[PDB]
Ligand binder design. Structure first.
Ligand code: CLY
Ligand code: MG
Ligand code: MG
Ligand code: MG
Ligand code: MG
Ligand code: MG
Ligand code: MG
Ligand code: MG
Ligand code: MG
Ligand code: MG
Ligand code: MG
Ligand code: MG
Ligand code: MG
Ligand code: MG
Ligand code: MG
Ligand code: MG
Ligand code: MG
Ligand code: MG
Ligand code: MG
Ligand code: MG
Ligand code: MG
Ligand code: MG
Ligand code: MG
Ligand code: MG
Ligand code: MG
Ligand code: MG
Ligand code: MG
Ligand code: MG
Ligand code: MG
Ligand code: MG
Ligand code: MG
Ligand code: MG
Ligand code: MG
Ligand code: MG
Ligand code: MG
Ligand code: MG
Ligand code: MG
Lengths: 126, 136, 78, 58, 179
RNA sequence: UUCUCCCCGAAAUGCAUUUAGGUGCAGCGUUGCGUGGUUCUUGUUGGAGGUAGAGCACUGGAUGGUCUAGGGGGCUUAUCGGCUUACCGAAAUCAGCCAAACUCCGAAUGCUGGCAAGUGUAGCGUGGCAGUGAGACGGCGGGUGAUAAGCUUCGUCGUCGAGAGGGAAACAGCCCAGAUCAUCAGCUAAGGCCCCUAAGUGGUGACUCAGUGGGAAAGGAUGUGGAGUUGCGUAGACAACCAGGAGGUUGGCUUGGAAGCAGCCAUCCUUGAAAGAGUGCGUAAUAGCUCACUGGUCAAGUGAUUCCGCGCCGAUAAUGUAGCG
RNA sequence: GUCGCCUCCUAAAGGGUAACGGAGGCGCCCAAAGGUUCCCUCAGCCUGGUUGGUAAUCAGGUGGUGAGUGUAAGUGCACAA
RNA sequence: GUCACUCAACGGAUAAAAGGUACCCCGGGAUAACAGGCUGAUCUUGCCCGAGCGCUCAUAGCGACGGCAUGGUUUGGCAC
RNA sequence: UUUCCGGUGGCCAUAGUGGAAGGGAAACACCCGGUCCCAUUCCGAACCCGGUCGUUAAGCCUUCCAACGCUGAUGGUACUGCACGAGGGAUCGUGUGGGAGAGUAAGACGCUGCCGGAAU
């Protein structure tokens, strides 16, 4: 469900983040050569999906909701770094090589930046 | 005299005189009407003459509506001049009338005096017109 | 007498669609000359400095809609 | 396929060039000349393009 | 009262077919409803003219093969200059069901000689029943003058005919003479 | 600017021009060589559109209604404030509208691709030789001009140009039709068939009486034939002929006279089978003749209104009938 | 009076199309008003508030483009150009 | 590589140029003056409606505001 | 497999605007702080970071309402390619093809793909 118009009655943070995400998606698009790495950052978790936007289907994904990461002791940024390592490992497992990173309306800073740097350490060409 | 407060363009092409009435073919204000059965250009002086005829016959009873406004400027070439050297200045204001257009409406007056007043008004217009009513 | 105070018109610019839907084009072929983006660049179509839309690759021209935008695509030839 | 029989009854002079090329495409050369065509939509379209110039039978 | 109209099936469509039908002293009509597809018929011209003399008449369309059908003429395309009916829209109706219609307006009041009364609408929206279609709705304005106005919220409506349209607009106006 | 025949066969457009009646290049002709269906027509299947039409969503224009912020004029009287808001009234809203330079819409065509069939022999590349670059009229869509011009300027198709034959009386441009030659054969097109003048003073059914046919407007009219709607009518309809055809009341602002006819008005009542404070004639002013209506002999249809076909008037220059040849 | 260029209409929904046809502009400007990256949403209306009033500045609601765009007009741009 | 043109009559005759001719002189009806032709704004001659004037009374005589035409002797438009 | 829900697309109002009621298991969200990375043309409002306490009040989600808005036939009409015809003229009509806009009946309180969570 993606209506081109930002639905009214949304909260202020939601409206602002929706505008920022729509502006980020103007230049970012996932193909088979370079799929899009979208990081959805909420107050508790980070959910990463690598998407081929031509077919509209996610190739690999990772989160802090997985079984082997609920019990892992660390900080929000440390958990995001572990998620970045995992998503890089899964991308190498599926043969992704290079991705285009999408911050999904958030600032490239902190948890998202740690996730991206960890994915770069894993072997992702971005 | 009906002249618009202002027009966007004072020099305009001649209005099309082709086709039946686009709108205003049914009575909407009064109880009787003058319906044009022919097309043409209805100037503001003819509209005024017809209005005076109706208003003077019906005297004090009822209201008269002019459904057509002369907001189309028609230019005039400088007199005794050859052709060219631009378009002339507006001289006449017209309404573009098509067959079936209700020109004037009349109400608050019985049918015979209404018929006579609208006969008087119709004898002022340059096209053919007829008396119409709301099916009695 | 008098004179005409008009009389100036610019030269014809010959804008408009040059390649219509389903037409086979080479890479770099101009699909439409236009002022502004009445058509937007789609997939395999680039936009020029004067808003000219050109083919970025070989294939067939198609006109369509992407989100809210009216776009021109060049679908690669099978 | 009833094998349309098309005969030219009027001349091509002063007709639209479309009509003259339609007459040429039907194989008609003179007034009174006749051709037999298969009952196919293109020949029927040609016949109805120049129906004021030809007559058609089966 | 129910006016019976003989109809027969229409199978040729277009401006030419309608022209031929109207040259044969007939009227094209389409009859649509709720539980059937639209049925295209052609009616006698003069009988249809007499039946459509009145407004909102209950018509019984009689087609030889099929059963009779009840209808109300919802749209009547008449010639503007002449009076001939050019096309009839027939909305099929049920006996045990309401109908929305447009009932007519007239003034039958007699104010002071100086002041005059006017009607500001042609027909008004009314929900009523089949066998009871009011002919008109009268507004009597006798001795009511000056800037009195009449809106659609307080009218002596007949039984079984509720009010549907917005009751916040005027239908009659009494005022001084024209100055 | 001088002999012949055979085949093909234009242009009067675009751009530029000390250019505009000249010329260059391009377009259109021809021809050698090359390449061959690439062209064209129709069908079918896609594509972009913003014209016609329509609409009022925007921008302007606009008619009426509801309601109202605010201006005008006055008042008790104004420092307010109230009585007005019966005048004006932005905007808001309801209803009907208008637009080449308005568009929430939106054709047919045209243009451009794919495919299929048909098809004259079309199209394309490259060389030799050009002429043309004053166009005209007609149909359709427009601008200028006045709803003008056999006007002017565009778009498109046709013809003339450069095209004979047949028709249009004659009559480049209109209609039919494109002449290789001969024919004292036939069938046809447009157009025609009483005679000029080839073929029907053709058959059948209607209409016209104006020589309409064989020119024209607003408008006027018991011409005529036909088809609807509606009022009165043997409880007796309309016209004609016999009696009540008038009371209070010379109802009022007039006007020496408006008593029924100067005009405007509330536009009644009565002896009563019956009548209008008044419709024509008459009339200085009043009288009066006589109209709508009531009974009688008679008595079978009369009165409006809408539309349609063909006609009438309006109609109107100067050598001679003279607007069917 | 005009002569080159640009925008719109005439121009008949591809492109082109004339008249001493109808409207306007240009012969610049900007070292940022260019490049890139990131963020933001306007005009108008309503209400509350010192100077302050219709309109400086602040606060809340509403408002999707009617604001804006260096400069004519048209095509665009609120995903903002 | 860059510079020098209101070469603006903007494809830009010369680096460099205004007038008179009634003293004039040597293709076009492609183009004006007369006349003819077309048109008919203007002109002209009529008419339609009838506000109102005529003591009263639209129409004896008139005839506002409007509308429709004739003629082709006016001034023009076109340029055959 | 299914149900519900959190993200991420496609169609871009049949989806929206408005109203009424209800729900939070994981998730979402408000929320609590500002020490730390980071920030406000002032403000931890926002951006950013540490938590997940409290709360479903709003966002979000489920259901109901045609109310405003949106979608919308059939038939007819306008218009129109080609072929004709009529009028003194503005202009009009027919044959043969194509055929709206408005309006009416009506639809509609979204459809759908991938990833994940909880239960099954
Ligand atoms: C206003 C006059 C118009 C022109 C006058 C005429 C013309 O050329 N006339 C000539 C005139 O000259 C002599 S008579 C003096 C000739 O004998 C005569 O045939 C004619 O040619 C002179 C100019 Cl007057 N043209 C034919 C038309
Ligand atoms: Mg309307
Ligand atoms: Mg650029
Ligand atoms: Mg540039
Ligand atoms: Mg030849
Ligand atoms: Mg030349
Ligand atoms: Mg040459
Ligand atoms: Mg139009
Ligand atoms: Mg020339
Ligand atoms: Mg020409
Ligand atoms: Mg021509
Ligand atoms: Mg000419
Ligand atoms: Mg020729
Ligand atoms: Mg000839
Ligand atoms: Mg002859
Ligand atoms: Mg030959
Ligand atoms: Mg014979
Ligand atoms: Mg014949
Ligand atoms: Mg003979
Ligand atoms: Mg005989
Ligand atoms: Mg005979
Ligand atoms: Mg005659
Ligand atoms: Mg006549
Ligand atoms: Mg003859
Ligand atoms: Mg175009
Ligand atoms: Mg075109
Ligand atoms: Mg040209
Ligand atoms: Mg030059
Ligand atoms: Mg020089
Ligand atoms: Mg000489
Ligand atoms: Mg000449
Ligand atoms: Mg002359
Ligand atoms: Mg002569
Ligand atoms: Mg000429
Ligand atoms: Mg619809
Ligand atoms: Mg339809
Ligand atoms: Mg429709």
């Amino acid at each position: 469900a993606s209506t081109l118009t930002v639905r009214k009655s949304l909260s202020d943070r939601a409206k602002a983040r929706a505008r920022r995400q729509a502006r980020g998606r103007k230049k970012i698009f996932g193909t088979v050569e370079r799929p899009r790495m979208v990081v959805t950052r909420s107050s508790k978790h980070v959910f990463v999906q690598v998407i081929d936007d031509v077919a509209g289907n996610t190739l690999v994904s990772a989160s802090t909701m997985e079984a082997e990461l609920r019990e892992m002791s660390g900080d929000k940024t440390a958990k995001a770094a572990r998620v970045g390592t995992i998503i890089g490992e899964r991308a190498k497992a599926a043969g992704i090589t290079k991705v285009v990173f999408d911050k999904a309306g958030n600032q490239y800073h902190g948890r998202i930046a740690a996730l991206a740097d960890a994915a770069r350490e894993a072997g992702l060409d971005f | 005299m009906l002249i618009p407060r202002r027009v966007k363009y004072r020099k305009q092409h001649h209005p099309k005189r082709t086709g039946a009435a686009k709108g205003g073919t049914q009575l909407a204000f009064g109880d009787y009407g003058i319906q044009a059965t022919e097309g043409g250009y209805l100037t503001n002086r003819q509209i005024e003459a017809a209005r005076i005829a109706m208003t003077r016959y019906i005297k004090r009873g009822g209201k008269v509506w002019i459904n057509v406004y002369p907001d189309r400027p028609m230019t005039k070439h400088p007199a005794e001049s050859r052709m060219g050297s631009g378009k002339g200045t507006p001289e006449w204001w017209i309404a573009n009338i098509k067959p079936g257009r209700v020109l004037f409406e009349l109400s608050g007056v019985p049918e015979d005096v209404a018929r006579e007043a609208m006969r008087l008004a119709i004898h002022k217009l340059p096209m053919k017109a007829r008396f119409i009513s709301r099916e009695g | 007498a008098s004179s005409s105070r008009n009389g100036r018109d610019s030269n014809a610019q010959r804008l408009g669609v040059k390649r219509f839907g389903g037409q086979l084009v080479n890479a770099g072929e101009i699909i439409v000359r236009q002022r502004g983006t009445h058509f937007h660049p789609g997939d395999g179509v680039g936009r020029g400095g004067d808003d000219t839309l050109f083919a970025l690759r070989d294939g067939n021209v198609e006109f369509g809609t992407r989100r809210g935008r009216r776009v021109v695509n060049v679908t690669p030839v099978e | 396929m009833s094998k349309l029989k098309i005969t030219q009854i009027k001349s091509g002079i002063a007709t639209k060039p479309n009509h003259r090329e339609t007459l040429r495409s039907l194989g008609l050369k003179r007034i009174g000349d006749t051709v037999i065509k298969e009952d196919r939509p293109e020949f029927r379209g040609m016949v109805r393009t120049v129906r004021h110039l030809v007559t058609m039978e089966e | 009262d129910i006016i019976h109209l003989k109809a027969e099936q229409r199978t040729e469509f277009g401006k030419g077919a309608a022209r031929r039908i109207r040259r044969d002293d007939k009227v094209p009509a389409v009859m649509y409803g709720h539980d059937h597809d639209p049925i295209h018929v052609t009616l006698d011209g003069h009988a249809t003219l007499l039946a459509l003399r009145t407004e909102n008449p209950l018509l019984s369309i009689e087609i030889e093969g099929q059963k009779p059908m009840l209808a109300l003429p919802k749209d009547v395309q008449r010639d503007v200059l002449k009076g001939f009916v050019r096309h009839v829209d027939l909305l099929t109706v049920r006996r045990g069901e309401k109908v929305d219609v447009n009932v007519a307006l007239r003034i039958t009041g007699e104010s002071a000689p100086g002041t005059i009364a006017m009607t500001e609408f042609n027909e008004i929206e009314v929900q009523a029943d089949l066998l009871n279609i009011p002919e008109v709705i009268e507004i009597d304005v006798t001795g009511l003058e000056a800037g009195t106005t009449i809106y659609l919220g307080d009218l002596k409506l007949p039984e079984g005919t509720s009010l549907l349209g917005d009751a916040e607009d005027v239908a009659a106006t009494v005022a001084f003479p024209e100055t």
